[PDB]
Structure formats: structure tokens, C-alpha cells
Amino acid sequence: AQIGPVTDLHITNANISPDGFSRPAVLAGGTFPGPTIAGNTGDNFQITVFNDLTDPSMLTDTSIHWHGLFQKGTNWADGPAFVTQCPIITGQSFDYNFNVPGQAGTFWYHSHLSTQYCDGLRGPFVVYDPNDPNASLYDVDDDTTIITLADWYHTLAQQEPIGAAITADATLINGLGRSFTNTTASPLSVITVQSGKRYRMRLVSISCDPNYLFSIDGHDMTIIEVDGVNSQQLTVDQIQIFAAQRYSFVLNANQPVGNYWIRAQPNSGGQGFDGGINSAILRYEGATVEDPTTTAPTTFSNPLVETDLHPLADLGVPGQPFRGGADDPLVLNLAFANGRFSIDGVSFVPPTVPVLLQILSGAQNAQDLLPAGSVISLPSNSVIEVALPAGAAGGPHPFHLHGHNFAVVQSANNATPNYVNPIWRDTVSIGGTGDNVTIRFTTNNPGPWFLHCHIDWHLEAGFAIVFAEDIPDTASANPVPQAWSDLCPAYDQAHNI
């Protein structure tokens, strides 16, 4: 049931009841999560998105981001509304036509207009590698080995009251789970394995907000990929996964034939597993069809710690081995007050003219780009360092950069940087008060790339900036199709702008 690399994707409204409570949703492919889009490394994806939305309570416009894909030469296809495009209006379609050179791993797609992905438009995106260096570590890698973790809300995203705390109502594992309050015995997801086989489980957080503590009773997990980056094998018994992150792990079906709880404990919302909340079932072939009776430990023996991850390939770290040892070293001031986030004293409010369009129209420095103060120029062919010191309320904040992955030179909860062999990824927790999480990358992809907290509620409240990488080369590097050029006039007409 995987679709792609060339496919239609219809976006519609429908009622769904993934925890036994019915509500309307915004869906790709008629389901929550959406269908898996898949192809092989280097493929041309042609995803024609049909906007068939009619319920204004969840917005009738849309735009879809392909999270983690670099979009080199195709910045217009990246998806963030008002950064790279105007939204697609209802009754229209748009062909996201791009290539995935040099990438293979586990990705996802989601609406990138307002908080609309929280209403349901989220799904997995897998780029297989026919020559995968990790192939011999497992026997099975297919749609049945994808595990999605999602938060689900009973209140519609646009209808979350101003100044009330937002928490989810259920954790969904592969689209099913039980509500934290008024819990009913709605069906749980089942992941089926065969005794003796080894599985590449692809763990995808499609969360709008919480991080999860993910574990499988009786089993351990050997991490082999992080946000699209192959890793050295790291065996763990629990993974803390933040919004938008992905891990692949090998699961060895080496326990007695039976039923085992799969656990995903969010950092907010319901605590524990009473009534089967926060749970799914790992069932071996031949086991009785019944709920697991297993328990978690009190304390996990080998939780994932991010500094223990290292790339499988010799990726190194660009620049020099000390703070500020980059061509463009930046330190962002990340703050929250009075309901709004800010970066360097500016709260992000999406502009009327998308940033890419402003560049292609001739705005050639970042001081000329709107929103004022929210667009930072980066020079071409340069090592960039970005320090993201934590402290702003609502953390721990998972920061994400479009167009790039990056070396995580300093991670949460550990003051020691690693300039030798840190993992590279695309979404990183910036940790807690006093931390100084820091990332490095090189600028070889001209275009405006969003940088933001991936808790969608924080993005909406302004926790974002745009890196306008290599403004002078953006137009030549990113030729745009006529259909893209048509988006802004159509949106502005339909909205009387």
C-alpha cells in the first residue's frame, strides 16, 4: 500500500475516531496517518497534491513539506507556506516535482500551513537504498515495519482557546490508541513479527508537540539510522524521540512467542499505561490473540543518549574544533514571553509575499526581505555554526532546519562539544536551562530555508527564522515552474489580498 514516487495525493476532510472519539480531520489519502510515500534513492518524485478541502474550521488551503529532503535546486517544492510558496487553494492541485539525490532513509510529510498538520495531514516518507550498507543487519523492511507516534487532540487546532494550555487527548501508535480521559477499550495497533527474524523498524515521530519515551517490553533496539543518517549500531532499551525525529532500529524477534507491550510515554498528557493508553502490541506469529501481560522495568538499563550515536560513514565536523570555529558563527537568542516566542528579539509572523518570491523579484539582501528581522542571510560555500541556548518556556524544544542536515556538536544535558564524530541529523532537542546545543553545516544549497521549533504550537506563536542561503544564486539555482508562479496570484485572488 506504499505509493510513489509518482502519485496523486488527495487532501480531504473526513470524520475519524482513532481513540474512539469522532472528530473531523484533514487527511492525505483518506487515512490517519497518511499513506506512505516511497521510492529509491535518487528517484524523481512527482507528488500531485489535490486540495479538496471544504471545512474552514481546519483551513481550506494547504501546503505540504517533505521533511528532511534537501530540495537542492527545487526550493520552490519544499512546502513551508509563505517561505517557499503560497498555499494551494481548494479545488486546485500542485505537482511537487523533485529529486532525492544522495539521500536514503526515513522521512515524513506534513502540512506546513499554520497548525494544520495537527488536524491530521501527516504521514511517512521512505527513501530506500538498493545498496544499503545496513542491509545485512535485518531480513524485513517494508510498510509493516514503519511505526508512527502521534499526538491526537479532540479540539480542532484552529479552535484551541487563546491562553489555555494545550495538551493532547491520546497517543496514537500506527494511528490507533486510547484516550487519556474517558478511556474506552478502542482497538490497539498490532505489529506482527515472526520468531527468529530481524526487522528494520522505522520509528517516526509525527508529533505536533510531545516527546515520547519509546520502548518494547522484553526487547532491545539496535539503532542504525538517525533522521536519514546511517549510524553505527547502538543497542538501547528505550528511545526518547522528539517531534519530527526518526530512528531506524533492528528488532530481533528473539523472545518467546507471545504478546509484548509497545510503550510510548509522552512528556505531557496521560502518564502511565492505565486502560492501555500510550500502548500498542507486539505480537509474534502463533501467539494467542490477547493483550500482553508484560511490565516495563522501573529503570531502563540502556536508554538512548544522543552523544553515544555516531555516523556509520566518516562524516566528521566542518570547521575548526572550538566554539566559533566557523566562517559564520551565530548565537541565537531564543525567548518566550506573553504568549509569543522570538528569535533575536523578533517573533515570526508569516509574510504576505513568500520569501522565495521576494528574492526572485529582486530583493537582494536580507534587510530588504520581509518579515523584517526574521530573515538572516548566509554566505555561500561557508561553514555555519548555530548555537541554540535553551531557557525559553515550553521546552525541551526540537529545532529543525530545512534544506540541510547538520552535525550536532553539542547535545542536550552535556556541556562537552564533539568536534570529531558526532551524529548528523535534522531535528535536535535544544535541552534545558543552561544548555548550549550547537549545530554545524556548510552552505551548498541556495535558497530560503526555515529554521524553527517543530512543536507546531510554538512555530505558530513565532519560534522561527528564515536562513536566506546564498541570495545571489537563489534564482539561477532554483528555476520555478509556471504552476508555482501561478500559486500566489490564485491565493491572493481567493483571499482578496
Ligand SMILES: *[C@@H]1O[C@H](CO)[C@@H](O[C@@H]2O[C@H](CO)[C@@H](O)[C@H](O)[C@H]2NC(C)=O)[C@H](O)[C@H]1NC(C)=O
Ligand atoms: C553558547 O556558545 C556560544 C559560542 O558558540 C557562546 O557565545 C559567546 O557568548 C559570549 C557572550 O555570552 C560572547 O562574548 C562571544 O562572542 C560568543 N561567541 C564565542 C565565544 O564563540 C554563548 O555564550 C554560549 N551560551 C551559553 C548559554 O553557554
Ligand SMILES: *[C@@H]1O[C@H](CO)[C@@H](O[C@@H]2O[C@H](CO)[C@@H](O)[C@H](O)[C@H]2NC(C)=O)[C@H](O)[C@H]1NC(C)=O
Ligand atoms: C558528553 O559528551 C561528550 C562529547 O560528545 C562525551 O565524550 C566522549 O565520550 C566518548 C565515550 O567515552 C569518548 O570516546 C570521547 O573521546 C569523548 N569525547 C570528548 C570530546 O570528550 C561524553 O561521553 C558525554 N557524557 C556522557 C555522560 O555521555
Ligand SMILES: [Cu+2]
Ligand atoms: Cu517537519
Ligand SMILES: [Cu+2]
Ligand atoms: Cu523540514
Ligand SMILES: [Cu+2]
Ligand atoms: Cu518549542
Ligand SMILES: [Cu+2]
Ligand atoms: Cu518547517
Ligand SMILES: [F-]
Ligand atoms: F526539511
